C-alpha cells in the first residue's frame, strides 16, 4: 500500500497540519490517545497511508513538524490531538527565523535541515510504497518560506520521482499581516516552481470571503479557517483511504490536471458550506453541489476565475451518487460557460467519485482548478515587490544575511516569465 509523508513548516503550516490530523483522526476513528475506536472495517483498511503502525493499537501519524522557534509546536503539543505525534519528529530550533527568507534558507535553518532530512528519510524508508510528500507552509515569513522551500528542494533531490504536493497559504494584500511578505513570496515562488509537482495555493482573504458570504459565522477565526483547509485537504486525498466507483490518486490528479510542468498552481475548493440557519433549507443534491463548487465565491484564491480561462478542472465527489447525473452536471457547467475554458483542450474536467462521505454529511465534493487567472496573484505580488525594491526598502536584512540584489532581480524575472507564460497560454487560439 502507498504512503504519504506529511511535513508541517512554520506557524501557519503547523496549525494547519495539527487541524488536518485532528480531522483525519476522527475521519478514521482515532482517539486522542492513539487507539482505534472505529465502527467499521473500512476505516482501518487503508490507515497505513497516514498512520504508521506501532506498539499495540496505537496508530501514530507520519508527520514531521518543523519550526525555528519553540512556539506553535509547543501550542500543538499542549492542545488537543497533540499527543498522537512522536516526540522525535518535533524537530525545532531555539533561534529565530525573523520572517527572513535568507535566515530560513541559508542561515539558521540550514543547520537543522540535515536533521529534518534524517527524520523524513527515516519515515520514507520505513514506508512500503511511498506515494509521496504533502507539505503545508506559507509564503509570508521565514520558516514557512525559506525553510519549507529548502526542505522541498532537498526532498526533490533525494527522491526525484515521487509525488510532491505543497499547499501553502499565499499572501494577501488586504489581509497583509507582514511587511517583508512580498519579499518572502517573490523569493520563494521561483524555488517552488522547479521543485513542487503540484501546489494548492490557499489565500486568507478568500477564506475570509467564503466564511463571510457562505458560512456567515460573523467572526471566522483561524481555527475554522484551518478546519476548512483541512477539510479540502482530506477531500483531495480521500481516494487513497476509501474505496470508490472511480478512483484517482495524487498522481492521477497531477497527470490529468497540469498540462505543462510550470503550470501547477491550483485553486482548491469544497462545497457543502451552508450557514447554521440555512442548513435545513437545502436539499443536498449533485446539481447544487456542482453549482456551488463552480461558484466564483467558493474559490480559495483572491483571483476571480472569470478573469481567466480554466486550463483544467478536477472534481472529487464523496458519497453515494449516480454517475450519469455527475457527468451530466460536469458537462452542463462546461457547456453553459465554455467561454471560461481553453478551446485547445476538449473536455478538461476530471471526475473522481468515491464512497464513504465525510462524517456527518450525506454527500460532499471538493474542487481543484488550474486556471490562467492565477497570474493576477503573482502580478499583485510583483507590483508590491517592485514598489518595495525600487527604494531598497527592508533589504539590509537580506543583504547583510548574505544575499544578492541580482538574486532578487532574477527571482522577479522568473515570476514575470511565469506570468507571461500563463498569459500566452490563456490567449492562445484553438488553431
Amino acid at each position: 500500500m502507498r504512503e504519504i509523508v506529511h511535513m508541517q513548516a512554520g506557524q501557519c503550516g503547523n496549525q494547519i497540519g495539527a487541524k488536518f490530523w485532528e480531522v483525519i483522526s476522527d475521519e478514521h476513528g482515532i482517539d486522542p490517545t492513539g487507539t482505534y475506536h472505529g465502527d467499521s472495517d473500512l476505516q482501518l483498511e487503508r490507515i497505513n497511508v497516514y498512520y504508521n503502525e506501532a506498539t499495540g493499537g496505537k496508530y501514530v501519524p507520519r508527520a514531521v513538524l518543523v519550526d525555528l522557534e519553540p512556539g506553535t509546536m509547543d501550542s500543538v503539543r499542549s492542545g488537543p490531538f497533540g499527543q498522537i505525534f512522536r516526540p522525535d519528529n518535533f524537530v525545532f530550533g531555539q533561534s529565530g527565523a525573523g520572517n527572513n527568507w535568507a535566515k530560513g534558507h541559508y542561515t539558521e535553518g540550514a543547520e537543522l535541515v540535515d536533521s529534518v532530512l534524517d527524520v523524513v528519510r527515516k519515515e520514507a524508508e520505513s514506508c512500503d510504497c511511498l506515494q509521496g510528500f504533502q507539505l503545508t507552509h506559507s509564503l509570508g515569513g521565514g520558516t514557512g518560506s525559506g525553510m519549507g522551500t529548502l526542505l522541498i528542494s532537498k526532498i526533490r533531490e533525494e527522491y526525484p520521482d515521487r509525488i510532491m504536493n505543497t499547499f501553502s497559504v499565499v499572501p494577501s494584500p488586504k489581509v497583509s499581516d507582514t511587511v517583508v511578505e512580498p519579499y518572502n513570496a517573490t523569493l520563494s515562488v521561483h524555488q517552488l516552481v522547479e521543485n513542487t509537482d503540484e501546489t494548492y495555493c490557499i489565500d486568507n482573504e478568500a477564506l475570509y470571503d467564503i466564511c463571510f458570504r457562505t458560512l456567515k459565522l460573523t467572526t471566522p477565526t483561524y481555527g475554522d479557517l484551518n478546519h476548512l483547509v483541512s477539510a479540502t485537504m482530506s477531500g483531495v486525498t480521500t481516494c487513497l483511504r476509501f474505496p470508490g466507483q472511480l478512483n484517482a490518486d495524487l498522481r492521477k490528479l497531477a497527470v490529468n490536471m497540469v498540462p505543462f510542468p510550470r503550470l501547477h498552481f491550483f485553486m482548491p475548493g469544497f462545497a457543502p458550506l451552508t450557514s447554521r440557519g440555512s442548513q435545513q433549507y437545502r436539499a443536498l443534491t449533485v446539481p447544487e453541489l456542482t453549482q456551488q463548487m463552480f461558484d466564483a465565491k467558493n474559490m480559495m484564491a483572491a483571483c476571480d476565475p472569470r478573469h481567466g480561462r480554466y486550463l483544467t478542472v478536477a472534481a472529487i465527489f464523496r458519497g453515494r451518487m449516480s454517475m450519469k447525473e455527475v457527468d451530466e452536471q460536469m458537462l452542463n457547467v462546461q457547456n453553459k460557460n465554455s467561454s471560461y475554458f481553453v478551446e485547445w483542450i476538449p473536455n478538461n474536467v476530471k471526475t473522481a467519485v468515491c464512497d464513504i462521505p465525510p462524517r456527518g454529511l450525506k454527500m460532499s465534493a471538493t474542487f481543484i482548478g488550474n486556471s490562467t487567472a492565477i497570474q493576477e496573484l503573482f502580478k499583485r505580488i510583483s507590483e508590491q515587490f517592485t514598489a518595495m525594491f525600487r527604494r531598497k526598502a527592508f533589504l539590509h536584512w537580506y543583504t547583510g544575511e548574505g544575499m544578492d540584489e541580482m538574486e532578487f532581480t532574477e527571482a522577479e524575472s522568473n515570476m514575470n516569465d511565469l506570468v507571461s507564460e500563463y498569459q500566452q497560454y490563456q490567449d492562445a487560439t484553438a488553431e
Binding site: 526525484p160 522547479e194 510542468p261 500566452q424 492562445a428
Partner: peptide
C-alpha cells in the same frame, strides 16, 4: 517575450520534462 509554445514543443522532443530541465534548456 519567448514563445513557450515552441519552447515546450522542442523540449519534449529533446526529452526534458521536469521544470528545472525546462529552464536549463531555455
Amino acid at each position: 517575450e519567448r514563445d513557450f509554445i515552441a519552447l515546450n514543443k522542442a523540449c519534449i522532443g529533446a526529452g526534458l520534462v521536469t521544470a528545472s530541465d525546462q529552464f536549463q534548456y531555455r
